[PDB]
Amino acid sequence: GHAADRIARLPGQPAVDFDMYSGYITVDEGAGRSLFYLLQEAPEDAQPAPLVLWLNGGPGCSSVAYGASEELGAFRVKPRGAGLVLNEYRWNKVANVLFLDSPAGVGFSYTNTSSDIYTSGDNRTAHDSYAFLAKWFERFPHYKYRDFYIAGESYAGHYVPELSQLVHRSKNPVINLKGFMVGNGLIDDYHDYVGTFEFWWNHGIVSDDTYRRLKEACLHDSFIHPSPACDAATDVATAEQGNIDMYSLYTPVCNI
Ligand X SMILES: *[C@@H]1O[C@H](CO)[C@@H](O[C@H]2O[C@H](CO)[C@@H](O)[C@H](O)[C@@H]2NC(C)=O)[C@H](O[C@@H]2O[C@@H](C)[C@@H](O)[C@@H](O)[C@@H]2O)[C@H]1NC(C)=O
Ligand Y SMILES: *[C@@H]1O[C@H](CO)[C@@H](O)[C@H](O)[C@H]1NC(C)=O
Q: Confirm whether residue 29 is marked as ligand binding.
A: no
Count of residues that bind another protein according to CB under 8 A: 117
Residue closer to a copy of itself, measured from CB, 29 or 188? 188
Stretch that binds ligand BZS, among 86-94, 147-155, 164-172, 220-228 (CB under 6 A): 147-155
214 binds, among a copy of itself, ligand BZS, another protein, none (CB under 5 to 8 A by kind): none
Answer whether 37's CB lies under 8 Å from 58's CB.
Answer: no
Query: Catalytic residue at 154?
Result: yes
Q: Does 68 bind ligand BZS (CB under 6 A)?
A: no
Residues that bind a copy of itself (CB under 8 A): 198-199, 202-203, 250
Cis bond before residue 59 (omega within 30° of 0): yes
Q: Does 118 bind ligand BZS (CB under 6 A)?
A: no
Answer whether 244's CB lies under 8 Å from 254's CB.
Answer: no
Stretch that binds another protein, among 2-10, 131-139, 227-235 (CB under 8 A): 2-10
CA distance 218 to 225: 10
Quote the least distance from Cβ 123 to ligand Y, whole Å: 4
**Measured in Å, how far apart are the chain's first and last C-alpha atoms?**
42
Q: Which of residues 190-229 bind ligand BZS (CB under 6 A)?
A: none
Q: Which of residues 73-132 bind ligand X (CB under 6 A)?
A: 112
Quote the least distance from Cβ 253 to another protein, whole Å: 6
Answer whether 39's CB lies under 8 Å from 54's CB.
Answer: no
Residue closer to a copy of itself, measured from CB, 91 or 197? 197
64 exposed, middle or buried (CB, 10 Å; 0-12, 13-18, 19+)? buried
Taking each helix axis as running N to C, give the angle between helix 228-241 and helix 208-218, from 0 to 180 degrees, rounded to the nearest 10.
150
Residues that bind ligand Y (CB under 6 A): 123-124, 127
Find the length of the chain: 256
Answer whether 95's CB lies under 8 Å from 51's CB.
Answer: yes
CA distance 77 to 84: 5
Stretch that binds ligand X, among 26-34, 46-54, 118-126, 243-251 (CB under 6 A): 26-34
Residue closer to a copy of itself, measured from CB, 145 or 199? 199
Answer whether 97's CB lies under 8 Å from 54's CB.
Answer: yes
Sequence ranges of the binding site:
56-58, 153-155
